[model samples]
Target chain A: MLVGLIGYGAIGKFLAEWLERNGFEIAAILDVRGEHEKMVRGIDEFLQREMDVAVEAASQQAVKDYAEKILKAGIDLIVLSTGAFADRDFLSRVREVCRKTGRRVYIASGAIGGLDAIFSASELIEEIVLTTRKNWRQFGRKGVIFEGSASEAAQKFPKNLNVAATLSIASGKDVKVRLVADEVEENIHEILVRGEFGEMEIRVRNRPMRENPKTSYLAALSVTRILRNLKEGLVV
Target chain B: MLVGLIGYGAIGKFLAEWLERNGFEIAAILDVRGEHEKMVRGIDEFLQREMDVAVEAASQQAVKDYAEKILKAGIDLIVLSTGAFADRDFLSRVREVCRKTGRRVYIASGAIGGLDAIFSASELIEEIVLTTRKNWRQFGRKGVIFEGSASEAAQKFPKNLNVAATLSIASGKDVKVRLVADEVEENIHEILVRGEFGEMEIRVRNRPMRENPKTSYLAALSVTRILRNLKEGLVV
Candidate 1:
């Protein structure tokens, strides 16, 4: 399968390289100046020839720019920059386009688990609660300053609130989610839920990837696994 | 929330009494006797009246006798006596009835854990290998005792073949499952699978319920949990 990369940054670079190593061809890399070749040296020839599925790893602005064209081209898009989706109006427009076309818009779980469990149980779920606790040093003064609502928390810490946005999307339009930041040694995501079926709990400790500290290695791996599964014949 | 139990035998009774103690009502209990009041005698009148779902804990013979009536009802049915389903003709009849009506039939995964994972990967699964090990005392060294294939092994040890059947049903008719008998102190069910996705392994050690050594206590709890999720609101 051919894959497109919206940004040649760390996460996007890592996913593109991994996909290539696993025998997937790169369709194209979309950048503001079309300087992805300069940013990502040594793979320009492969990109020019084989890139196909577009991946929006750039900032929200990049997604706002190329989403419509990619969808019009009949290429299914996967968004890793989930914070952009917080804009309800823009998200609704994107959803409208995805519905109009046969293609699907996939929003990865990013660094979280249990949201899928919530989606699966949405019909029978009455309430959902999300709590995130991480080391104070990871966010420095940023952690202590954002003592606002979950939506505000997402705005304050863009990297941290990807999980909150995931919860918002999975729980539908009006579902309320709570986000808490505490001083701890490791990055921990905890989801606790209660309903008629009783209580369910899930906790995942994210370890820093070799090249990045702000992102967990498991998060990228999960995204790649999901993509591999989404491809036609690569997965069953 | 109300939980329906179709069978009132050891597993059904245990779940009903346990859920009640945990502050949930058992909607209704259906058995060969068809006597809920006499079977669930100690529960409060409030709970007895509020129970709404059905659990089928009747014997195999009883299932054959009531198959028609069970399928005609609109309520969901959880089949605990899964051995009755091994008979292809009887199972086909049940399927025909379910097709004719909108009602659903759920076969509980007793003494197993990987069904959820298996069901997720069913479309990708090429084959399934099942190994059921139990103590020799359960069998008197009689019945079908060949060792060439899974079917032969399962037929020889009828007490231990339920796990194999569960895998067979979950993977459709294409997958291959194996069964083995050993003189282990405890009953253990292990599944090794190779599929388009990857290699996956699952092992479940079941502690028999006090009332019946042949059945696992945890397995019964799992079925109760599955049925509870099906009937009322669930957090997961």
Candidate 2:
């Protein structure tokens, strides 16, 4: 299968390597710093060559700018910047384009886990909580950053709150987001959900990308598995 | 898409209703108690009409009996009878067939949650623990039923241990299974995972299928979502 990647940064490089190792061909890439041979300057150039699927490992702004065009071009997308979808209008517009074009927009569960559980029991779920703790050192003082609804969290922490957006989008309910600055090496996510299903409590401590502490290694790894799920028959 | 089902019991009935609600057509079904018009007595008759997908909501024995034939007939399968896969030989044979033909087998997360977490972090995961407590009333007592590897649990309690097999298979590591018989109305599953990435603790209390306490409503719902993921442009 031919794969197109949107970003050329740490996560995008990880996915490109993963796709090649798994026997998928790289068609093109959309990047601002486009020096690579496979990188394209715009969506038009990227879509000039057909791709089976496209993955956005770029910023939330990139999703708002480029998602509809990719889907309308009849290519499926696996998006990492889920923060874009927190804006209900953009999400609905993307859905409408997909309905018209018959292409899919896949929301990758970036930086967190246990979504399978929350999504399965979404109907009766009354409460959803997401508390994230990371020692990125950029914030300096180690304490609470913000605590609010998922939509507010996305705007407050655009680079760090895709996990919140993913949880809210997958569960069809608003997730309460809490950000903590701590002196910890691993990135941590604490999730709590309750209602009729009855309760789910999850905590995942992830190893951050060595090059970029802001990016969780698990986040980059998940896209590879989602890609493999598409090719293999035995899906877990 | 035209869908075929291999069981007509509690879970199967739930899936049929869900499929209809989501706009999928039921082509036929394979059931031994063959009184219903949609029920077929043999695989040959089941394949007489082409189906886009087949679901096995039947017993473990049914998977060993009918899985290969359905896949060879060019229909992908969603298998709820995952206990059958505890046999490495059978699993290998099925994978070989999927490789030879372009069909895939899907293992449903029958009665548990947190699978998305396990699968994404599978490579680094070192330990997985599954402890289940249910008040089935069939056991007639409240105590520990079994404690061992996932494969042993699958064999000792084929009807109830699909969750153990699912955890083990999705993680690519053996899960320690501990089954506790208890006087509880809600079927409960407790999961603990630790690895290079970090740790995960989850507890799910599921409302059982009223017709059959052994089956989980969440189990039936997961298949419906998986089906929707295939059709929709926006996959979560």
Candidate 3:
């Protein structure tokens, strides 16, 4: 299948190469070069384009530029950099496009765990509490620059809090998410979910990929698993 | 939607009641009532013979006995007692049946986490280590069972070693699973999955259901989550 990517940076590069090595063709890529229109030529090439899947590994701005086109094209799009979703306006626009068209957007559970639980809990849950405990080094020399729970932290470090964005997407606006920055050990993320359904605690001490430290190889692995399920028709 | 459940034990009863309380109907239930045909009949009546989803909360024997029939019924089956899957012969038979019948079996990541990572590592996973720490009381008066590895402990206390079965199924046969029994304050299960994909550490301190201490409340929550996903037609 021909796969389209939206960035050439670490994550985009990693996902692109991995999909290629696994026998998928890289159909097109969109970066800061403003190649969204030129990469595939136009609306016809963009819509009738022979691509099976499109992956947005680019930044928030890139997502804003391409998300509408992708939805209009009626192709499946996977959003890896979910920090862009922190902007309710952009997210509303994407939702509007989805409603206008019939396309759907899939987000990867980035850097953190329990998106599954959070999604499930959304049904019966009156409250949602998502906490991420990560080493400060993973956030660079800034060292605990983000503060005040996951919501405030997402606002503080928009680029570094994709997990918070993921949680927000799953549980809705009133949900509470907490982020903890620690300098003690390896880059690990722990998620604790509590609600009427009971509580679930999960953790992932990520091993940094040489290509990208902020993006765990396991995160890519998760995206791959989701892709595999989608391809194999394993909808569950 | 008609929801079919496969067990009548603590977890199953709790989930069935909870779902019923939430306005969903329990379509079918399968249990080892010593009469296979009679049990099937009972399930048909309970489900009102219109099961949209099949849920397996039964034991290993029940899964082995009725898996084929459930698959042939053309409904999706969710396996909650995943430890029963550690048996290669039984698991293979179920897989072959699903393949032949064109039906799908969903395995819920029950009482554990890191499946998102383990599944990723399934391709390049060189090795895996699983450690389960639980209170002695949960194991009954069997008292201080084998104080060694997962296999050893499983051999000693078969009823409480679902984690081993869970790890074995997720990591495939090559991965080694270890279990550690501790006199902890609560029921805690810690799984440390390390491989080429990444290293993940998951710790869950679960409270035993008021109905059954042998089975965790977390397990029920996981099943509830899976059921909600099946009904919702979206991934959280």
The reply for model 3, stretches above 4 Å from the true place, is: A1-8, A23-46, A50-53, A61-74, A87-105, A117-141, A170-186, A192-203, A231-236, B21-25, B32-48, B99-102, B124-127, B135-144, B147-160, B173-186
TM-score list, all predictions: 0.50, 0.92, 0.79
Cα lDDT of model 1 by residue, A67-184, tens digit: 7667767776777667677777878788777767655666665655544334533334566556666656654533534444457766666645676676666555333444444655
lDDT for every model?
0.57, 0.83, 0.63
Query: Compared with the true structure, what per-residue lDDT tens digits does model 1 show for residues B1-236?
Result: 66656556667777777667767676656554435553543223213444344455656655566655655655445666665666668777887776677556666656664454455445556767765656556565533233344445445545345656566665554334533445555556666665543445555555556666667654565565555444332111
Preferred candidate (DockQ higher): 2 or 3: 2
Error of 1 at A33 (Å): 8.5
Fnat, one value per model: 0.00, 0.69, 0.28
Q: Model 2, stretches more than 4 Å misplaced?
A: A34-37, B34-37
Which lDDT tens digits does candidate 3 get at residues B111-216? 6655655665567676666655566665553333444445454556544567666666666643444444466644566666666655666666666677776666
| Range of the 10 consecutive residues with the lowest summed lDDT in candidate 1 chain A | A38-47
Give the top-scoring candidate (DockQ).
2
Residue B91's C-alpha lDDT in candidate 1?
Answer: 74
Top-lDDT candidate index: 2
DockQ, all models: 0.04, 0.65, 0.28
Docking class of 2: medium
Over A51-164, each residue of candidate 2 has an lDDT whose tens digit, in order, gives 888999989999999998888888889999898898899999998999889888887777777777677677768999999998848777789988889988877776657999
Q: Among all windows of ten consecutive residues in candidate 2 chain A, which has the lowest summed lDDT?
A: A115-124
